[PDB]
Amino acid sequence: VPLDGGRFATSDLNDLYRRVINRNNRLKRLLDLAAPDIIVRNEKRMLQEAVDALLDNGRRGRAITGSNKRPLKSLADMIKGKQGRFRQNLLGKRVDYSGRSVITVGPTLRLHQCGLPKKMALELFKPFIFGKLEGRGMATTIKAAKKMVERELPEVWDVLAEVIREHPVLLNRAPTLHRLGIQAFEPVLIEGKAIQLHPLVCAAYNADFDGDQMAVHVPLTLEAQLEARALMMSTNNILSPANGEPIIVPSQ
Amino acid sequence: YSYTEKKRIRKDFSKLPDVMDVPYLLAIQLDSYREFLQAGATKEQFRDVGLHAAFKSVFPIISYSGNAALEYVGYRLGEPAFDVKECVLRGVTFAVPLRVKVRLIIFDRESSNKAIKDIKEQEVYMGEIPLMTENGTFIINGTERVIVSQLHRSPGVFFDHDRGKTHSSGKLLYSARIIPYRGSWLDFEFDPKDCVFVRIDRRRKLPASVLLRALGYSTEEILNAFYATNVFHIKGETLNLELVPQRLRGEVASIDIKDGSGKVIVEQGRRITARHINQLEKAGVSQLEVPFDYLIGRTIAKAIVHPATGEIIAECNTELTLDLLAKVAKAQVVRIETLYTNDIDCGPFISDTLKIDNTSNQLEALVEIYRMMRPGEPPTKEAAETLFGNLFFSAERYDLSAVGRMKFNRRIGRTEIEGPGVLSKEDIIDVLKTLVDIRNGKGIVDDIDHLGNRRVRCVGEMAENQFRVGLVRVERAVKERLSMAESEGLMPQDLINAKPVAAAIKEFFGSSQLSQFMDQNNPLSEITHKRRVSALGPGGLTRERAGFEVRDVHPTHYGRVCPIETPEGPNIGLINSLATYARTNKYGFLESPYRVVKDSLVTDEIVFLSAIEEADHVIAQASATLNEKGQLVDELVAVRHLNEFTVKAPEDVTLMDVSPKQVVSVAASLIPFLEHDDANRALMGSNMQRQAVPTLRADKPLVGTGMERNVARDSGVCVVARRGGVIDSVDASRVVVRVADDEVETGEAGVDIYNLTKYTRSNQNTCINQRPLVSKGDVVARGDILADGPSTDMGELALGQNMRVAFMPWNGFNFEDSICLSERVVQEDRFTTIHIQELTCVARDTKLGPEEITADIPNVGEAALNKLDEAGIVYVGAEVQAGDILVGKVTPKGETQLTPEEKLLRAIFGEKASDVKDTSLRVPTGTKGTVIDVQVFTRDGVERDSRALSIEKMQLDQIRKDLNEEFRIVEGATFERLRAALVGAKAADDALNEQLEKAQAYISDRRQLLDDKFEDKKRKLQQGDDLAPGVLKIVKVYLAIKRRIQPGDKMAGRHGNKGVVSVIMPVEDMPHDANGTPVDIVLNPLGVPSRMNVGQILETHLGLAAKGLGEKINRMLEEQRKVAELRKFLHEIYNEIGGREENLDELGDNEILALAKNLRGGVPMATPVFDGAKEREIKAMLKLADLPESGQMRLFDGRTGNQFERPTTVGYMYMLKLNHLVDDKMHARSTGSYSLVTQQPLGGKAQFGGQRFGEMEVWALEAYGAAYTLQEMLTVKSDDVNGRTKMYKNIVDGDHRMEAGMPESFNVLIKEIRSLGIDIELET
Amino acid sequence: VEAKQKERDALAKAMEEFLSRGGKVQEIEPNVVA
Amino acid sequence: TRALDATQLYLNEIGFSPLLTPEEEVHFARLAQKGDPAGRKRMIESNLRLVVKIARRYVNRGLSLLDLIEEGNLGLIRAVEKFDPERGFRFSTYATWWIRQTIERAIMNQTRTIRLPIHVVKELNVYLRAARELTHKLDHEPSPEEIANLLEKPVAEVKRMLGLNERVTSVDVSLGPDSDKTLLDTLTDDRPTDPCELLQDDDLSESIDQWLTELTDKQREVVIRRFGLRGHESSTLEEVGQEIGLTRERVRQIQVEALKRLREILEKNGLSSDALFQ
Amino acid sequence: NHCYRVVGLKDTVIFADQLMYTGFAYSTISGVSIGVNDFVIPDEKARIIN
DNA sequence: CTTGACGGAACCACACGATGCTGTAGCTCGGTTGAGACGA
DNA sequence: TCGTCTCAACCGAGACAGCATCGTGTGGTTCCGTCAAG
Ligand SMILES: [Mg+2]
């Protein structure tokens, strides 16, 4: 890709594949001159170490790049990447319709509901507000819809509150400890930027209010909302999976 | 008495008197920089380690097969021309040259004084000096980065136990890890089968006999001198033995030793006791008779070659047998050399290691060390000898300082502390004697978790090592270039190259992990990041290499390493801190001072004591009973002698502590009541104080420790007074002071300018500023505080603010550890914070079309065009909303392949078909503030924007204004000096004329000086700076967000009580007392039993007492009483049980009114860490101000109104503000641009990405018995092509079908698998 | 360590003897390349 | 044990290379001229010391040493292949010049990801050599102004020439020693790959399709046939003069009044310039 | 756990918020606090230490 | 409903280097493998 | 007297110049899309 100032951003796999391409071209240009045994032995050994540097790195080749000290990345670092021998889809997976925030406690809310600020409520319900705005009959376009949700209009809360009262949301702690770290709740319309939570679920979270970074999740289809309210709604996972004690534990 | 103490004095409670003032905090890096740089010195510089010591070891050189020499007398330091306030706004990174003078002396290659052609000339500037400031930091390309003291392992050899699962034994010896300063890492592992085998980095295991034969020592002499010293002879009764009483001690003698002319010593079957040892000592019989069966177990030292036979009858280091003794008897051997080993003595493991693998030749050891370095190569003796010499003897790519030889001499035992920097074979003899002494069991094993085994480094030694590496690289390059050259054919300047040392000093600060970014969000972070002691980096242990060895502490850290200061997270224990009174040694050793005490009296002098003598000497405790006579009243005190706490006698100790604050670092010591808290939550509170942010209104802390003024004094953001005098005029941009006639020179008496730091950007995107706290017409002293920085007020450290605080679980708002605020903190803007947000936009040049700062940007509405000018930059101080275009950047495009829909919507509106896109940067979501300034950088000889012209003209008129005001103050000082001079005997005349001419010469010199200063400022501001290649103009806009209190902010106190605020509750819902002041921030009472810190209650009680005294002095000032009542009030305050009184000194008209106006907003305390305020003075301070004695207030219910049938506790808690807000962490993304290797969203499209849905997230998702959301979140939210399109069409149209489809993850997998040629097909 | 110090002392003594035995100092420019 | 490497094995294999007098090489070059597979084999298997001596000088580059010894023996066999023995001189200098040409081609083609011809890498090489000569006397960072003043070249020309030198680093070596996050998940592609962009594209296409179906038939025909939106090609009124309307001015007035009608129904539908183009 | 096991889910989770609300109100109108007189120190501790 | 004029693409010839090729001759802990030890 | 049964190290994870076309810049006419004028 073109970078800032005419520069480029390449991976090391381009360099190793270009190197084995040039070594095979030199093999093609050397095989047609009645070559002796020693130089074709050396060239086949060179192609052997070349394709060994193609498949793996850090065993016997130890190839270095120009003007640096880090070794190049083979195709093992494309099927795996970093973090040991774990795959690239298994090392990191940035999921859409998410975003990290800090949490706070809300004591005036029930177990079947929660709080959520409007600044993220305008975006976590974005296909829902697009469908409602194109179905009710106020704005059939999507660019004017983006303009009216970025302009902070007065009617966006009135047309947005229909999918706040009876629509589940997911919330997961970024340090994951057990299966109660993900939950399901019902938002309301409040002010501010951070998220109010149920008090009696932080003991199930094993997450005291220490100002961490908690990410939210919103599934797209309503079938996933129905099954999330069936599987991880807080009126269902009352008992802990360890023993017969409930995971909702009363605090001091 | 300072001038800041007249405005604010602190009531201390230290029962122990202060015997030593707090030293300089950043003096270690200061004198390390002074030793490495050597800026101020005479013609004879110091012979210590540094850049001069690195240059003198390399700069004398000799050409191979030629005649060349290079001499030098010294170097010349460069003058720093770049100002700090202009390099943080321009990007010069404090460039400073360093020129050296080299003498190119040639010879005739005959070792005589013939053809002496010397060329003494000054060379080019070898790189650029960092040129750090007096505060202890240096700027590296715009940002400020600092160094960290590398707490790696000390240079030398250690001997630990290291009991692990690999040895599978109860008692085993660990491997001797020889640690040099740089390079040549050698290992010595002790094999469990009575052997020793050395190790290398890539080579296999090698025996110690081959290593000794490669070093130079023969195997026979080493095997002789390793075990013992005993000779065997054949005389008299067929054998002659040399009896040693030391070896026979504790050995069961199974044979008869009745020789000694009829005197039997030990019979057969009798254990040798001390009585037989004393009998042998009083007898002195050196010859004893043993049978031949005892000689079978013995092992020879060298080979027995008889001169009469002519052949080798016994091999070297072999056992003696029944035929071998008969052969040695029949060969007429007079003296037999063999070793004598016993069971009670040391085990003969060195002989068994030397007898292994048949290593007895020097050529075999040479080819073994050649195969260990370069296996499968041509075995040459000269090449292997040169490789071994460059690895061990020569200093090529190997630098060892004298501290490694000093530690080796302290380990193996030597009278000389200073040793040679090059390693020799004699050190190998000492380390083999040390390892066989450790395997014998005598002595004590070394501890790797000790302060002696972990040396604290600095920037000077690593910078000298990097400069030495670059200098030997440049020397090798110059020797390769000047190989075939001559003296007249080449040049001495053209042969040298300053490029490798410049690249080395570039990578030492740019790509090094030790030169990380300085935490400048808080002054506590600024003073602690210098004093960090990290074990990571090069030559140290990383996070996964810590284990259970370096994460533990030994009691030899008494006053050296503070364990209550380390960052929490994935690394606790290996990154340490430096203590307060701990001062490093010349050898880089961590030492702490101790008070020498005799048996009767107490001495006055203090000596800095190391750690090697504290294991032999007794260290007492300073917190003891003293009757003002120099003796301890108690007969038993907790002392420590052998690095372990015990009880001792007062006439037996020799040393004691200087101050109780010498063990804690400067991070944790600012928390009051450390002795009432646990170290866990005090460490957590110190970490949140290090990660703190400043506030808007800097309110003084209520409960203070006393070192707040000290840490405000040593901080570089404060204004320190160089010279005293009266103050003429005070301005928020600059301040000037007058110079008295005592501390001044003859000419240029009054010259003192102080540019206050304006609102610029820190490293953690927070604002920094200087506020003056003085008046007009007052005198100051040396080191006085003129203007305080952020989170500092009126000379002391004032981080946060205080409010009324009670301990009550109120309606679940403070549920577990949470916070419940009140409307006063949002109505008075108390704990609000303002961040400066950076936005770096580039204007590069592309091959298809250049870019520029043009205001004519397509797709720009009225609200965006009204903010920006005809140039393209928004004006200074405009309101920036969410989604605003700030900078002007238009990029061109060609062959875009536009769709018919885009040209249709372009032709409907009638707009022109603009082929140039708009890639101007905008603000992220949640940022709505006001910009303050914009910094623009252009290239040399390029077109400049008109906004850049306005910026540089504003900067030049500001510079000319401060130059004019300093010229005005210096001409006013000269005129008032002349007017004070002419009044003496006005009514001789030649003197007055002379003085007027001298004053005219002085003001014309000052005028031409400000003219050349303005010329330098013009030539430095009009020129272009060194920027990135391919960039035409670099702009950066400084957006300031006026963030307020929002529901969900982070709020923690000082004792490690983390909490989040819930909502904005009003001032009436909180419970109130009968006085009229309702409580503001209510906390939970779980912080005291669960977290083991009761200092919350004591701090809030002293805060309640301090607010009671403050309200009493406020209503006393309101009641308009006389100064006698105020001084009696101060007398009854400052006459408690703890501390001392400093009254009856201040004057009533000036200083009493000054302390009243500067203490009406609260009073500070001064408590030490381990001998602080007791509880009875707190009960007195509670009971003297019409407050209850136990904090048992009677409160009224604001909610229900029912009377509480229980007394409650209220008070004042001084809490801190954290950098854990929501706005910097908020990611607002519904749909994001997918990646290139798969269809997963990521950042880069002006929207932050989501979280990592890794293995544990999907594991907790399938923890329940469900299957539909697991595939819905995997094929709809990501990893599809048309599935998201058909699902969005089903969402818009309303009807749902839930088609399965085919994801692209299977396509990426089948391509990555078929890239290896794998048959995959479907049956169906 | 000691060998480099002895070589430095010998080179300094030889340079002092050359400067005191008729030899002079050639002051080249600070910025000059062949 | 034994070494499981390749460089050591190569160095042990090249130890059987003889070095006789020059008459043996003269006889081998004379036998190789007529055509025989023995003199070329001896010249390729007995002259590797100069090859490894050439390859040892170009160390610390973007290639491996096996590539350097391979271009060395490739240049040597290309030198002795088309070798003319009429000069009567030593072929070691000819093999040295051929190995220099081959290592220049190896620097040209195996260092940077963007390939370059001979002349641009030659002017880059002499420009970096001149910068290396001037930075010893400048004692500062090299700027293009002094290079343009010394080389008698314009500043924009040498800036465009130094802009080709990208020197791209890796995508796994991040900033700092602790590489907890790579650079693969940092930057995205420049093309529109977001579901928001394609979603706005299909919604705008369906919107203009509904607005063309809700308009008149002639206006929808002249708006679809001119731009090629509703299943039409890239033809206009000059090509549709025998399809829709013969007069170009009449269909142009029809087109601009249809565009005005579309603009006024977008204005009545809540679509303006500031709400569409920010 | 007992009332959950004997009534199911809905009555348990509607009892939970009401118990939480009355616990929050009875914590708000309560008046306990940990003070300096809360930590009672016996006189026999110094005797045991001596 | 007709007419004539200018700015912006649209292949295409000319072309100026420019691509392309060629000749000089001196940390803890689990799977693998070579080596000693005992009975039929 | 030899096959099999343990057993401790080994390894790896969380230069220079010349020759033969050549490919898009640089207009070059030409077609097209639009702008007044009745
Ligand atoms: Mg937490």
Side-chain angles (χ1 to χ4, degrees), chain B residues 301-303 305 307-311:
Chain B
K302 61 177 62 180
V305 179
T309 66
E311 69 269 357

Side-chain angles (χ1 to χ4, degrees), chain A residues 93 100 104 123 193 218 252, chain B residues 815 1061 1223 1230 1253 1277:
Chain A
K93 255 181 166 293
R100 297 186 292 191
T104 194
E123 53 97 17
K193 193 68 66 67
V218 281
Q252 81 274 35
Chain B
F815 177 76
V1061 302
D1223 295 332
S1230 309
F1253 210 81
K1277 310 183 74 67

Side-chain angles (χ1 to χ4, degrees), chain A residues 173 206-212 214, chain B residues 817 1058:
Chain A
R173 193 187 184 188
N206 201 0
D208 44 353
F209 294 96
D210 289 25
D212 304 331
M214 268 61 60
Chain B
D817 45 352
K1058 295 168 172 52

